[PDB]
Amino acid sequence: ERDCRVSSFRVKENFDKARFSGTWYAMAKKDPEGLFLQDNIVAEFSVDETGQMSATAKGRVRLLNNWDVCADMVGTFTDTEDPAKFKMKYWGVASFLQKGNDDHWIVDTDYDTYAVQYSCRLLNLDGTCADSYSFVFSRDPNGLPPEAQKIVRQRQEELCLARQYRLIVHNGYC
Ligand SMILES: CC1=C(/C=C/C(C)=C/C=C/C(C)=C/CO)C(C)(C)CCC1
Ligand SMILES: [Cl-]
């Protein structure tokens, strides 16, 4: 019954880059295919005088055969016609870290408590996502208050992802 076409997904009305700036702690994630950030994930968002949003991110990644490594990433966002939908060019401060360019949607936020992010890297032929990821962020590293949690759960369901998240631990690995 639920519409899981990516083109159907609502995102944050009148998204405000300035209000979104600062530190966001990843509390949960739905993983894409392939190498991804593992845990201890913290993002720092900024916006400059011209209005270009950028970010940095720290987090543990496990390069295969179980090598751990605190990845240190940089992201720059290109605006689209939708104020909450961006193209994110990203890379690591080290050359060998993953680079690429992902859709970056702010699905919902209240700016001072929670944010829900979404990226579809590849569509299915029916308009659903073949390869997605999603972060839930909190301003407080100790987690969301119940009212925000309940909103986030609704957004998770709307993205057709609600069963597919895992919690992210923060234990000082970085
Ligand atoms: C950059 C960046 C983001 C995603 C970064 C990613 C996905 C990094 C992946 C790194 C890997 C896989 C390293 C292993 O080589 C998110 C969406 C958190 C917003 C904050 C800025
Ligand atoms: Cl569930």
Ligand 1 atom with the shortest distance to the CA of 90: 1
Ligand nearest to the CA of 97: 1
- Say if ligand 1 is within 6 A of residue 75 CB: yes
Please report which ligand is nearest the Cα atom of 45. Answer: 1
Q: Is the CB of 53 under 6 A from ligand 1?
A: no
Q: Is the CB of 6 under 6 A from ligand 1?
A: no
User: Can you tell me which residue has the tokens 């993002």?
Assistant: 43
**Annotated resolution, angstroms:** 1.5
Which of 17, 98, 101, 168 for mutating ligand 1's site (highest number of atoms within 8 Å of CB)?
98
Atom number of ligand 1 nearest to Cα 74: 1
> Can you tell me which atom of ligand 1 is nearest the CA of 117?
17
- Annotated binding residue 154: no
Please give the tally of structural domains in the chain. 1
Count Cβ neighbours within 10 Å for each residue of 63-83 and write b for 16 or more, e otherwise: eeeeeebebebebebeeeeee
Domain extent for 91: 1-174
Number of Cβ atoms within 10 Å of the Cβ of 25 = 19
Query: Which one, of 64, 54, 40, 57, lies nearest residue 92 by Cα?
Result: 57
- SS3 for 156? helix
Q: Is the dihedral of CA 129, 164, 154, 88 positive or negative?
A: negative
Helices (H) and strands (E) in the chain, counts: 2, 9
| Nearest ligand for residue 160 CA | 2
| CB of 37 closer than 6 angstroms to any ligand 1 atom | yes
Q: Provide the residues around ligand 2 (an ion) whose CB is within 5 A.
A: 163
Listing DSSP states for 8-70 in one string gives G----TT--HHHH-EEEEEEEEE--SSS---EEEEEEEEE-TT--EEEEEEEEEEETTTEEEE
Residue 120 and residue 103 in contact, taking contact as beta carbons nearer than 8 Å: yes
Sign of the torsion angle spanned by Cα atoms 128, 77, 166, 14: negative
CATH code for position 150:
2.40.128.20
